[PDB]
Amino acid sequence: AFVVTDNCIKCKYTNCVEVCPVDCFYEGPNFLVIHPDECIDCALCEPECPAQAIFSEDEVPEDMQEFIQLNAELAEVWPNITEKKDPLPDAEDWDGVKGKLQHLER
């Protein structure tokens, strides 16, 4: 499985969803998650993220391990997103800011 981590929060560019061959991204207010059962590990989304927030689960940073689990449980509760959208208005001011998990919205 590929995993969306901290820097997607409050950016949510959604570039990643056009490349997914199996449409396994799910959408929250200010973040996206990958459903781990569905991902086929094609790695196509990882170069597409402006925020470089996607990682192979074996590559997730030591300080971001919580995201592996988070992606798995939020994917169960959020709706499927299959079309790109515009970025959050604010996206480019929040891109690169650390610790954005305290800003996550369910």
Please enumerate, by residue number, every residue annotated as part of a binding site for [3Fe-4S] cluster.
8, 16, 49
The DSSP bridge pattern shows strands 25-28 and 54-56 to be unpaired
| Per CB under 6 A, 15 contacts ligand F3S | yes
From residue 51, alpha-carbon distances to 37, 38, 73, 76, 77 in Å are 24, 23, 22, 24, 24
Contacts of ligand F3S in 51-90 (CB under 6 A): 51, 53-54
Work out which of 3, 10, 14, 94 binds ligand F3S, going by CB under 6 A: 14
The least distance separating ligand SF4 from the CB of residue 11, rounded to whole angstroms, comes to 17
The least distance separating ligand F3S from the CB of residue 32, rounded to whole angstroms, comes to 4
DSSP annotation of 86: P
- The closest of 41, 32, 50 to 2, measured between CA atoms, is 41
> What is the contact surface with ligand SF4 in residues (CB under 6 A)?
2, 19-22, 24, 34, 39-45
